[PDB]
């Protein structure tokens, strides 16, 4: 898979479209898109382990973590594979997403295809807020909108 795509949706007004592209085999992945309907400020942005959303974020489960580490920001050495940090939602409630990341992949053992991308309620504290919950979820709390990452043309 060179390209992939995700369509975020939920119960609330949150919705959006995120693209992935990877040009080298175990190279970096460009992540880009838009999300309307958000509160202003920062929101957590995570690839969770499974794509099964029959039961919401209980079936999609935890942050995608094939190397059994603690939660962190994308720039940290100690992080989950799924940790892509935050997205900035402006005054109107739009976040123009743009990220580059070489820990996620579209192939191999860190392949995100078939897993659930999620925009969370609060901001990702990057594991630095200093408690048990900070090193699982970064206290971004509840799901706003989510979708399965699928293969794209």
């Amino acid at each position: 898979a060179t390209k992939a795509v995700c369509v975020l949706k939920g119960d609330g007004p949150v919705q959006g479209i995120i693209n992935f592209e990877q040009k080298e085999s175990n190279g970096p992945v460009k992540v880009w898109g838009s999300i309307k309907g958000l509160t202003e400020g920062l929101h957590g942005f995570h690839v969770h382990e499974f794509g099964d959303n029959t039961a919401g974020a209980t079936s999609a489960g935890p942050h995608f973590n094939p190397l059994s580490r603690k939660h962190g920001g994308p720039k940290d050495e100690e992080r989950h594979v799924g940790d892509l940090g935050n997205v900035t939602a402006d005054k109107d409630g739009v976040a123009d997403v743009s990220i580059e990341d070489s820990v996620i992949s579209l192939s191999g053992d860190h392949c995100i295809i078939g897993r659930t991308l999620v925009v969370h309620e609060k901001a990702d504290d990057l594991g630095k807020g200093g408690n048990e919950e900070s090193t699982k979820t970064g206290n971004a709390g509840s799901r706003l909108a989510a979708g399965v990452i699928g293969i794209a043309q």
Binding site: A1, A4, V5, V7, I17, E49, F50, G51, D52, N53, T54, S59, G61, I113, G114, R115, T116, G147, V148, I149, G150, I151, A152, Q153
Partner: protein
């Protein structure tokens, strides 16, 4: 790093002092996990990350010729599993689950509500692209370059799963096995259900050999990774040519 398999070389071994020497060459070497030396078989199994070239040279460094005869990994794994949730414009909704029973046989089983009673085409399509409802998903999944067919045809699109019947109340319950479809080969692709019947290529219509003339695409989902019921196996005990594994079901 380099990832570890188990390497099997065959060595001419006769005396206990030869075996002492073979173990000697791999005893505490950088990156060799475990050595095992079946002297009835005249064989040396090597649990290691290292390349076959390098490891053959360390055995041959003593002065014995070490012919490699196999590589394997006694790691065990679960059957693969997946789920697609179908949604779209309006009434049609459903869940379809996939389970790879054998590496040659996949089990598909699901439930789709809000269908105009009778037969509807069900197909795996190429892309998991829900950007433009079900029209962004591309064609029937067809990596072998076959012509469209029904599930009882050798020549068919991998993605061709034939029809499902919506009952009285507009609801399709179905189970099926398919031998060309494979869960590992469709994660991230899409499942789509259609307006009307797939003709299985037997309509003599221009679309027959291409879509089976199935109509508008009503609802689609991405074929997504699911947790199994069962956790990943765990080795609890080993010996020479025996490993014992535990497999526990998931909590919830």
């Amino acid at each position: 790093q380099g990832t570890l398999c188990t390497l099997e070389f065959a060595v001419q071994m006769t005396s206990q002092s030869s075996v002492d020497a073979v173990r000697k060459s791999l005893q505490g070497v950088a990156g060799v996990q475990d050595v095992e030396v079946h002297l009835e078989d005249q064989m040396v199994l090597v649990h290691t990350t290292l390349p076959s070239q390098e490891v053959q040279a360390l055995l041959e460094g003593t002065g014995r010729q070490a012919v490699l005869k196999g590589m394997g990994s006694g790691q065990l794994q679960n059957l693969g599993a997946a789920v697609a949730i179908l949604g779209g414009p309006g009434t049609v909704q459903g869940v379809v689950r996939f389970l790879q029973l054998t590496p040659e046989r996949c089990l598909i089983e699901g439930t789709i509500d809000g269908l105009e009673p009778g037969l509807h085409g069900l197909h795996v399509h190429q892309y998991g692209d829900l950007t433009n409802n079900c029209n962004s998903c591309g064609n029937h999944f067809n990596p072998d370059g076959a012509s469209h067919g029904g599930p009882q045809d050798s020549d068919r699109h991998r993605g061709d799963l034939g029809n499902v019947r919506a009952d009285a109340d507009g609801r399709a319950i179905f189970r099926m096995e398919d031998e060309q479809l494979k869960v590992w080969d469709v994660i991230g692709r899409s499942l789509i259900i259609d307006e009307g019947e797939d003709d299985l290529g037997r309509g003599g219509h221009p679309l027959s050999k291409i879509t089976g003339n199935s109509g508008e695409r009503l609802a689609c989902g991405i074929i997504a990774r699911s947790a199994g019921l069962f956790q990943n196996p765990k080795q609890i005990c080993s010996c020479d040519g025996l490993t014992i594994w535990e497999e526990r079901g998931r909590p919830i």
